[PDB]
Design a protein around this ligand. Structure first.
Ligand SMILES: CSc1nc(N2C[C@H]3C(=O)N(C)C(=N)N[C@@]3(c3ccc(C#N)s3)C2)nc(C)c1F
Length: 387
């Protein structure tokens, strides 16, 4: 329905992440926490770091409980290590509840804390299967549902500004909404379409067709989900498996061929600039991803614009962007620049993810993002990867 207390509770941007305010401990210690659907640990800075202006001080919390256990988390782009414990946790612009949750108190880290991101921790919203050190460490959302009457569902509206925000603007700007326990109808237009959650670990989905400006990429659909496809608010880009990326970039270059861009642009490294207000959106194609539907032999599609996959960056008065589609060796990742086009419902209770056109997606007067269906699609189970 309407969840006014939770609307506009996020801040941030696709490149540095979107975060929500939380409190930990007694008396409450306020921290800004990255919303990460990629993930399943609640982990906070708990020791001084050059990029943190605040951190969780366990010795100042009367409700802190030491689990006497360490946690070491090395991932591809970074790492952190910490100490496990529990404490009382709240979301000020959330449900009016306080829960006893696991907290990984980060004591050492490498390339984890982003300089100027304004967040001091991460809220992993995915399932216990991928929690560290193992699946016995109950994720935050599981604790929230178990201890309260909050429904087993959350929804995210990530709002890209469509232009760069400076340090002061990004702190003063509304970055979107995280609705805990419900769906807020003001955040989207049109209908919600649902795709099954294939398996509960990451938020895994199945893509069954890909089009660039209505032209079928025509790959075996298993390629689109090799080795998985996930919905991840903690990734900036739309990431595609190597072969799919190679085919998609060739098609995007062909559609936009009236302007030649350097190789560094297509690699997502180099910015491209245009005179203020002259970005030629119309030369870039729309991209549609068809997702398995809830009805047998039915699919639907989500369509994004270049206003989603060209990420605004500062250079001058020029309008500059980076290409926010990139290669992956770990499957498709529907990151923040995809999520910025849609209101996304993580319906854990019904094992499904819903998509609707976001009320805050960036567009022009000629084209809009879309969520449309149904389409008749056969043998969709064959699109999923096994082994
Ligand atoms: C690979 S297993 C694993 N991974 C993570 N993360 C992976 C990071 C990762 O590359 N992405 C893509 C992720 N969605 N989340 C992580 C982030 C770190 C910093 C972020 C920002 N901004 S997002 C945490 N955290 C934990 C606790 C893990 F078990």
């Amino acid at each position: 329905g309407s969840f006014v207390e939770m609307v506009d509770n996020l801040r941030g941007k696709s490149g540095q992440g979107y975060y929500v305010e939380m409190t930990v401990g007694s008396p409450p210690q306020t921290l800004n926490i990255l919303v990460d659907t990629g993930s399943s640990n609640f982990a906070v800075g708990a020791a001084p770091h050059p990029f943190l202006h605040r951190y969780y001080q366990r010795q100042l919390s009367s409700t802190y409980r030491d689990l006497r256990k360490g946690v070491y988390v090395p991932y591809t782009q970074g790492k952190w290590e910490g100490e496990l414990g529990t404490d009382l946790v709240s979301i000020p612009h959330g449900p009016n509840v306080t829960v006893r949750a696991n907290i990984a108190a980060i004591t050492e880290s490498d390339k984890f804390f982003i300089n100027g991101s304004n967040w001091e921790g991460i809220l992993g919203l995915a399932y216990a299967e991928i929690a560290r050190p193992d699946d016995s460490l109950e994720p935050f959302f599981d604790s929230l549902v178990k201890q309260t009457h909050v429904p087993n569902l959350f929804s995210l509206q990530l709002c890209g500004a469509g232009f760069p925000l400076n340090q002061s603007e990004v702190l003063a700007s509304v970055g979107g909404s995280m609705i805990i326990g419900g769906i807020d109808h003001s955040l989207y237009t049109g209908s919600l379409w649902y795709t099954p959650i294939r398996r509960e670990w990451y938020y895994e989905v199945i893509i069954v067709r890909v089009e660039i400006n209505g032209q079928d990429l025509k790959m075996d659909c298993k390629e689109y989900n090799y080795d998985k496809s996930i919905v991840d608010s903690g990734t900036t880009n739309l990431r595609l498996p190597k072969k799919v990326f190679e085919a998609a970039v060739k098609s995007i270059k062909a559609a936009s061929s009236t302007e030649k861009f350097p190789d560094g642009f297509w690699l997502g490294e180099q910015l491209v600039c245009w005179q203020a207000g002259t970005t030629p959106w119309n030369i870039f194609p729309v991209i549609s991803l068809y997702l398995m539907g809830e009805v047998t032999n039915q699919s639907f599609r989500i369509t994004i614009l270049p206003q989603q996959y060209l990420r605004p960056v500062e250079d001058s008065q020029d309008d500059c962007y980076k290409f926010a589609i990139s290669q992956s060796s770990t499957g498709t990742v529907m990151g923040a620049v995809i999520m910025e086009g849609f209101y996304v419902v993580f319906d854990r209770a019904r094992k499904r993810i819903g998509f609707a056109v976001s009320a805050c997606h960036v567009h022009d007067e000629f084209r809009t993002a879309a969520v449309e269906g149904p389409f008749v699609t056969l043998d969709m189970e064959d699109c999923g990867y096994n082994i």
